[PDB]
Symmetry: D2
C-alpha cells in the first residue's frame, strides 16, 4: 500500500448526509440527520468522518439539508483541528422547512473545484462499516479510472434486492440492473475472483452491488456534473451509468468487510443492539488503530446505585438507581429511577443534566424530570434524547402494533418499535 501524492493533500472527502429519506423519522424530526445519536456515545456522522481521518483524508465536507448548531458544535468540538485539514458542514437550504445526491454535490461544485486535489471521495448513505479508503483510492489510480465504484459481493439470494453491476475481464463496470427478477438476473453473474475473492467464496457470491460510495477524478466529476449530465439527480442511477455510456473508465473495487445498512428504524434498532452481541459484536466502535471518534465531553464515570445489568453496554456519565437493565444500550447522561426495567432497548440519554433545584421546580409544577421514571418498563424501544418518562410508564405494546403516528403523545411505532420522540414528556401511568 502506497498513495503518492499523499491522500491527505490529494483527496477531498464529501459526505452525503442531511439530504436523506425520512426513513428514520421521528429521529430526524428535531435535528439534522447526521446528528442522530448512535452507539450511545456517538452520532451517525461520526462513522464516515472517522473513516476519512483514519484513512488519512483530512479534507472533509459534510453535506446536509439544513444547518444545525448541534451538528456543528459536535463536529467543531470533536474534529475542528485536523496542519491543513478541516471538517466543514455544507447545507443545502436556509431552513428546516420542506433533493437528490448528484444535485447535492453539484450545488457546491463551485466550492469543490477550488481545492487542488486528484480525486473526490463521495460517501453517501447510512451505514456502519469500517473501511480504509486508501486502498480504494490506490485502485482508482493504478487503473487510470475516471470513476471507481465500491462494490459489495453477494449470493444470488439477496442479490435481487440491490442494484447489480456487470464487469469485464479487467473489472471495468459495463452494465447495470435493478433487481433483475430472474429471467435476466443470471446475465449479471460474473466471477468475482477478478476483484480479489478466492475461487471458494467467489462461487458463493457471484454478484456485485453498488455500495453508493465512489472515487471520481477531480476533472471527471466537474465535467460529469457541470456538462455531460447537468440535469441528473442521483449518482447510482444516472451519473455513474451515464459516464459508462460515454465510455469512461468506470472501475469496480470490492469491499469484503462488515457492512450493515441503517437507514430504517428497524435496521438502525437492530444495528444498535448489535454491540451487545455474544461473544463478539461483528462491528466494534473502538479499534486500536481505526477507532471511531466523538465529541470530548468530560462526563463523570457512570454511577450505579443497585443495578443488575445483563448483556448491555453503558455510555458515559450515567446516573443509575436500583433497577434492571437487560440486553440494552444506555446512552450518555441517561438517568434511570428506582425499580425501572429496561429490555432490548436503546436509551439515547440526554444532552445535559438537571440539578436538584430543577427536579424541584418540575415537581412543584407537576411536570416530569428527564429520564426513565420510577418503576417504568421499557421494552423493544428507542427513547430519544431528553425524554421525560413519567412514573409507572409501561412501554410494552402488547397488542403488538406496527404502525402509529402518535406524535401528539410524544411517540411513534414502526416495525413494532416504540420510539419516544426527543424532548417528549410521557405522563405517569401511561401504557403503550
Amino acid at each position: 500500500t502506497c498513495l503518492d501524492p499523499d491522500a491527505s493533500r490529494s483527496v477531498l472527502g464529501i459526505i452525503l448526509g442531511g439530504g436523506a429519506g425520512t426513513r428514520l423519522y421521528p429521529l430526524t424530526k428535531k435535528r439534522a440527520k447526521p446528528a442522530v445519536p448512535l452507539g450511545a456515545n456517538y452520532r451517525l456522522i461520526d462513522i464516515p468522518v472517522s473513516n476519512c481521518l483514519n484513512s488519512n483524508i483530512s479534507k472533509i465536507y459534510v453535506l446536509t439539508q439544513f444547518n444545525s448548531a448541534s451538528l456543528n458544535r459536535h463536529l467543531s468540538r470533536a474534529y475542528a483541528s485536523n496542519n491543513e485539514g478541516f471538517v466543514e458542514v455544507l447545507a443545502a437550504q436556509q431552513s428546516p422547512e420542506n433533493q437528490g445526491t448528484a444535485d447535492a454535490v453539484r450545488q457546491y461544485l463551485w466550492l469543490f473545484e477550488e481545492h487542488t486535489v486528484l480525486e473526490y471521495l463521495i460517501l453517501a448513505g447510512d451505514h456502519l462499516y469500517r473501511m480504509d479508503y486508501e486502498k480504494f483510492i490506490q485502485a482508482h489510480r493504478e487503473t487510470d479510472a475516471d470513476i471507481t465504484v465500491a462494490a459489495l459481493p453477494m449470493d444470488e439470494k439477496r442479490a435481487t434486492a440491490f442494484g447489480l453491476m456487470k464487469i469485464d475481464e479487467e473489472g471495468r463496470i459495463i452494465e447495470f440492473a435493478e433487481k433483475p427478477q430472474g429471467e435476466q438476473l443470471q446475465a449479471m453473474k460474473v466471477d468475482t475472483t477478478i476483484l480479489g475473492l478466492d475461487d471458494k467464496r467467489a462461487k458463493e457470491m457471484p454478484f456485485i452491488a453498488s455500495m453508493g460510495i465512489y472515487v471520481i477524478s477531480k476533472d471527471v466529476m466537474l465535467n460529469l456534473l457541470r456538462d455531460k449530465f447537468p440535469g441528473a439527480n442521483d449518482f447510482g442511477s444516472e451519473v455513474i451509468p451515464g459516464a459508462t455510456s460515454l465510455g469512461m473508465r468506470v472501475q469496480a473495487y470490492l469491499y469484503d468487510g462488515y457492512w450493515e445498512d441503517i437507514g430504517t428504524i428497524e435496521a438502525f434498532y437492530n444495528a444498535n443492539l448489535g454491540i451487545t452481541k455474544k461473544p463478539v459484536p461483528d462491528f466494534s466502535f473502538y479499534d486500536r488503530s481505526a477507532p471511531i471518534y466523538t465529541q470530548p465531553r468530560y462526563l463523570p464515570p457512570s454511577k450505579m446505585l443497585d443495578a443488575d445489568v445483563t448483556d448491555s453496554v453503558i455510555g458515559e456519565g450515567c446516573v443509575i438507581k436500583n433497577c434492571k437493565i437487560h440486553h440494552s444500550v444506555v446512552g450518555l447522561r441517561s438517568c434511570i429511577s428506582e425499580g425501572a426495567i429496561i429490555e432490548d432497548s436503546l436509551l439515547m440519554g440526554a444532552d445535559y443534566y438537571e440539578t436538584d433545584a430543577d427536579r424541584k421546580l418540575l415537581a412543584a409544577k407537576g411536570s416530569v424530570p428527564i429520564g426513565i421514571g420510577k418503576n417504568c418498563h421499557i421494552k423493544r424501544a428507542i427513547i430519544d434524547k431528553n425524554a421525560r418518562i413519567g412514573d409507572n410508564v409501561k412501554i410494552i405494546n402488547k397488542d403488538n402494533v406496527q404502525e402509529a403516528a402518535r406524535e401528539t403523545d410524544g411517540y411513534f411505532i414502526k416495525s413494532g418499535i416504540v420510539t419516544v420522540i426527543k424532548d417528549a414528556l410521557i405522563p405517569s401511568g401511561i401504557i403503550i
Copy 2:
C-alpha cells in the same frame, strides 16, 4: 462583576508542586511521578490543579516534580497563549533517594519563571482534591495590596492539630503561624473566623484557620524571598511564608469555602476515591457544567457488562465486565473483571491498554494470566494499580488484618489495612493475600 485587569491569562503564572519522590503515596508512586497517579477511575491527580487553573483562566502553568514520568508527559501532552510544561529536577523515572523541599524545587527554577512577564505566581500543591476559581483569590491579592495571600481553611479543634494554623488580625492580615500546634500552643491560635467573612455559627465551631498549600505571590516578592531572604529554606509555606510574615511583609489571608481533602495518604487517597459513591451525593464531584475536571480524550467505547450487579459504585470508560458482583467500588478505564469475580470496597485503577486475542490465546496456550481480575476472585478493601495481572481464585482480603505491611516483592503493600497491589504486578492463581 469584578474582573482581573490585567486578565489572569496573561498576568498570572501557575506553578504546580506536582510532588517529589512520592514517599508518602508509595507504592502508587513506584516509578511513577506523583502528579500522574490515577484518580477516580478516569483521571490523574495532576488534572485537579491544572483544570482548576484553566477554569480559573490561568493558561500558563508549570509542574515541578522531583522526577519525571513517560505517562505524565503523555497525559499533559495529549490532554493539554498558554502551555503546560513539566519541570523535573531529575530526568529519570527512578524514585529519587535524595530530598528536595518545596522552596528548593521552586528556587531551583526561579530563573526560568523570571522570564515570564506576570504580576503574580499561583503556588498550588498538586496533592489535594477540590475545586476553586483562583480569580477572586487573585483579585483579593491585588485589592488588598498584599505581598502574599494565603488560602485559609477553617476547622474545629480536632482537625486543627494536623495543620499549619495562621493567626490573623482584625483586617485579615496574617501575623503568626504554628505548625501542627497542640496543648497550649494550639489554644493560642484560636481566631475569629468572622473577620474573614465566615458564617457566625460556623465560626464558633471552627475558630481555627489553616494554610492549605494555596498561595498568591507577587513576582518580586518570590524572587526576593527565595534568593535574598531565605536562600537556605527547604519548605516553602512551612518556613518561607512564616518567615515573610516576620519580616513585616503584607501576608493576607483569603477564606476558602468548600469541599477540601488532602489525598497524599494511602488511606486518605483510598477514602476520597470511594467517597465518590456516597449513597446520597459525593461531597466532591469531578463533573461540573461550569468548571469540570478535564482529562485525556480517550475515545474508549461504552463499558460492557454481561451479568453484573453493581451497588454504590462508579464505572469508568470502556470496561469489560463479565458475570460478577461489584460492590461499593471504583472501576477505572479498561478494567477487565472475569467470571465469578466479587469486588468489595475497592478502587480498581484499570489498565492503560487492552490485551488482544493474540496475547490472549498466547498467554492462554503458555498460561500467563491476562490483565484484570481473574475468574472467581475476591477483592475486599484494596487498591489495584494499573495493568494488574490477577490470577484466578485470588482472594485479596487481608485475613490476618495487617495494618502496616511492606511486601514489595510479592507485588504489593498494605497500609491502614489497605492492600494495594502494585502496578504491572502479577498475583499467581490461588494466591491469598
Copy 3:
C-alpha cells in the same frame, strides 16, 4: 474593573452583515462575496469585524452574505477554525453576484431560526464594511445596565458630515427617541442635540451636535424574535426601518457614544482612501496591528519581501513581494505582488496574487504570447486598484489622461469609478495598452 456576567463568550452571539450583491464595490466584488475583498495589503474586510469580536471575547460568530465565494470560505477556515466558531450563513449558494435584492432585515430574519438555537442573552449586530477597532464589551455592558432592548452605537459629527448618515435624537438620559434618514435642510437642523449628554466635552459637543447610527447594535434575544417575526415581519432594512419602528413602539432603544476612528469602506472612492490611508504621516489614524487587539488574518508563511532596486516613498509592502528595479510612491503593495523592471507605481492599491507563478509557467505564458501575473516591465500605474492575479503587460500606462470619472469597461478588464481605475481580478491588459 467590571465585565460581563455571564461573559460575552457564552451569552453573546455575533451576527455580521457581509453584504448583499456588492453593487457598490463592484468590480472588486465581481464573483467575490464582499466579506472576502482584499484589505490593507494582507487582510480581507471580514477580518475587521471578526477580529473585533474575538478581541471583545465573542467566540460564536456567524457571517451573513447574499452570495458566497471559495476564498471567503477557505479564509475563514484557515484563519479562525482553530466553544466558538465563525460560520458563513449565505442567502444564495453560488459565487455569482445575485441579480435580485435582499435587505439586512430579510437577511437576519431568513436565519432567525438558527440564531434562535443559541442560548445567548444578546445579538451583537455588526455591519461588515467599516474600518475601525472596538471593545464591544463595555458597549454590551451598557445594554445590560440600562436594561435596554436595543443599544445603538452612536457616532458624533458636524452638520457637513451628518447629511450622509442616519441621525438620531436622544433625550436627557440618552434614550433614543427619534430617527432621520440622511436628513437635510431644516429636517437636519431639528436633529441637533447636546453631545455632552453621552459623555462628550462641551468643546467637541459644540463641534459635533449630531449623532448617527453606524450599524452596530446589541439586541436582547427575544426583542429580536419579536421585532422580526411579529412587529415588523415585512421590513427589509434592519437599521433604517426596524430600529426606528421599535423606537416608535416605546421599546428601550438606548444610545452609546463611540470615540475613535471609524470609516465606511463600502464604496470605491472611500475604499481607495482608507487603504491608501495607512501610508499616512506621521502616523495612521487606523492601525491594523495593536498590542492587545490586533487585526488577525490567515497565517501564510510567505517569505520576507525581496527588493532588487526599489525607490520606495510613503508606501506599504505586504508579505512575500518580488520587486525589481522600480518606483513605488504613496501606494499599498499586497501579498505576493510582482512589480517588474522600470515600473512606476504612484498612489495605487495592488491587491497582489493568490499564488506564485514558477519560471516554467512564465515560459509557457511567454511562448503563448501571454502576460505573467503582476505589473509588467516599464509599466506606469497611478491612482488605480489592481485586483488579485492581474496580468499587466509590458509598457502599460494606466494614467487616465482624459480625466474620465465613471467608466464601465468590464470587457476590457476595468471600471473607472470617481477617476479611480480598477483592474478586475485575473484581468489581462496587453502590452502598450493605455488606460
Copy 4:
C-alpha cells in the same frame, strides 16, 4: 512507507549544547532559538522538514529551557507533538543527550528514530530516507553527502560495499588512506558522470536508527560513548550491524560559526536563485504567526536586500542586507551588507519620550547611523550617529561591556546592547 512516518517514526532534534561558536548570538537565548532569515529561528529548519515529511512525533533537545523558545514552538506548532527536553536545570556529549531520555523515547511505539544534529539550512524529505532504511533491512541508515577532494579530506568519510553497506570510517583522512576511501558513488544514487566528479561520501549528522537497535547501542553495547558520529555508529558497524548509507545531493550549507551563519543569511538575497529559499510551493519553512502589520517605508532606496515583517523604515538606504521583523530604521541611516535580527516588540511614541528624558536610545537603528558588515541582534538600541564600520579592518575581538563582539571581521552587536550616540566601531 508503511506504517507511515507520522505514527511509526519519532523525531529527535539536537541543537543545544555549547555551540559557543556562535557567541554572542547564543549569549542569552538557547541555540535553537537563534533568529534566522529575517522571519525565523534556526529550529524552524529541522522541525519544518520533519512536518513536511509527515513527521509528527518531534522532540527537541536543548541545553536549557527557554520561555521564548517554547512560545515559538507552541505558537507555531491529534497524534503528533513538538516538545522541548532540557538537559540541564539551569542556563548556567551527544549520545549522552539521547541516552538521558531513552526512557522517554523507549515508551513511544515506533519503528525508527530520526536523529538530526547540528544546524544548517537544507530541505529534505526524510521519508525516502526512511523508506531506504526499511527496504535495506538496515538497523542504522546514515546520511551520505558526496563531495570532491578539498571537502572529502576535511570531513570524516565512509567506505561502502556493493550493497550500499558502510564498512569503514575515517576522520579527515589524507594521502593513501584518503585513497583507500574512494567509493564510486554510483551505488548510492548519482550516475557515472556525477560520481566520477565526487567519489567520496561524508556523513551529514542525520541517521535513521531502528527503535530497538538504538536502545541496545546506548544502554548496552555502548553506554559510555559521547558521540553518535565517530563513536556509536563506527562502533555500531564494527560490531557487525547492517549500517547503510543514503545519498543526498541538495543545497547544504552549515552555519555553526558567525561567518558561515552571516554568509548563509545574506545569501538568501543573492541574485537569481539564492540556492535556498525558506518558502516553497511544496515544503515551506514554517514559523510562528505574529500578525505583524505590513512594512512601512517613508523614503527608502533598497538594493539587493530583503525586508522582513512589520518593519518601520524611515528615510534611508539599504544595501545587500536582511532586515528582520519589527526593525525600526531611522532617518539618514545607511544599512549595507548587514543582517538585522530585528526586534521582539515595539515601543510606543509615549514610551520613547520616557527614553530621551532618561538618557537612553530607543530600539532600532538611530538617526544618521552607518552599518557595514555587521549583525545587529534583537532589541538592539543604537543611538544617533553610530558607525559600525570596523575602520581598522580588525577580525576577532571582544567588547562585551561595549555591547559588541567581533569575529571574522564581523561586528555582532549583543541582543539588547545599548550603543550610545556618536560612538563608532
